[PDB]
Structures are given as C-alpha cells and as structure tokens.
Write a protein that binds this ligand. Structure first.
Ligand SMILES: O=P(O)(O)O[C@H]1[C@H](O)[C@@H](OP(=O)(O)O)[C@H](OP(=O)(O)O)[C@@H](OP(=O)(O)O)[C@H]1O
Length: 123
C-alpha cells in the first residue's frame, strides 16, 4: 500500500505559514500528518488532474508546487482537518512544498509523477 514517505515543509492556504508535516503518497493520493504516529490524516490531496512544477521561493529552497493546469487560479479540491479535528474543504490555489534536499525534492517530484501516471484515468 505505501509508496513514498518523508518529511516536508508546506505553505498554508489562506494563511501563509509553513508547517513541518509527515507525508505519505499512495494510490495517487497525497497524505500528510503532523507526526509519523498520528492515527488520522491532517489533510488529503487527490493528485488526479494535477501537475508539479519547480519554483523559486524567497524563504525556503528546494521547492516545487502542485497546481491545476486545467483551472489556473482556481482552488484545488482537497480534504483537511482543522486543529480541533473539524473536516473542511481545502483553500489552496497551489500547494507549495520545500524538500530538505534536492535528492528528496526530485525523488518526490518523480514519485508524484509516477503515481499520477500510474492512473488509469489519465488524459
Ligand atoms: O495554523 P495557521 O498559522 O493558521 O496556518 C494554517 C496551516 O498552515 C494549515 O496547515 P496544516 O493543515 O497542515 O496544519 C493550513 O491548512 P492546509 O494547508 O492543510 O489546507 C491552513 O490553511 P487555511 O485553512 O486555508 O488558512 C493555514 O491557515
């Protein structure tokens, strides 16, 4: 079931704060928890119909983003839980994330392209 896991830094949506989060990529779904032993996902991002792209950030290096080619400037459909556990839809136009190192950043990038590609509903 698992495919790839490791820590990453992601920028919030409405509020632009980076949070260190544990990520798990599986079945073309990208999971992130606050801790590796967390029992439930803090957020879930369905990667279908999305694309990654290298970016340059003025605060964190080794970045890349997830955005929707088809609907530029439109909020990406995701599921997230608030601090208290309340379930809400995500509010990201793009998901910017900085890896700890280039090998990881690129390993994720490829690995995320691998899962999107291993999708029988690709266009
Ligand atoms: O705690 P503050 O400083 O308010 O910032 C939060 C965190 O960055 C959240 O990340 P995480 O959920 O990983 O803890 C993020 O939710 P997501 O990035 O998951 O959507 C929120 O986006 P908004 O709820 O859109 O503001 C953002 O407001």
């Amino acid at each position: 079931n698992p495919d790839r896991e490791g820590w990453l830094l992601k920028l919030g949506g409405r509020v632009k704060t980076w949070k260190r989060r544990w990520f798990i990529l599986t079945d073309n779904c990208l999971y992130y928890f606050e801790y590796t032993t967390d029992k439930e996902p803090r957020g879930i991002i369905p990667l279908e119909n999305l694309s990654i792209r290298e970016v340059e950030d003025p605060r964190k290096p080794n970045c890349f983003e997830l955005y929707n080619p088809s609907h530029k400037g439109q909020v990406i459909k995701a599921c997230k839980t608030e601090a208290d556990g309340r379930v809400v839809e995500g509010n990201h136009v793009v998901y910017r994330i900085s890896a700890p190192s280039p090998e990881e950043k690129e390993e994720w990038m490829k690995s995320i392209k691998a899962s999107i590609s291993r999708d029988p509903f690709y266009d």
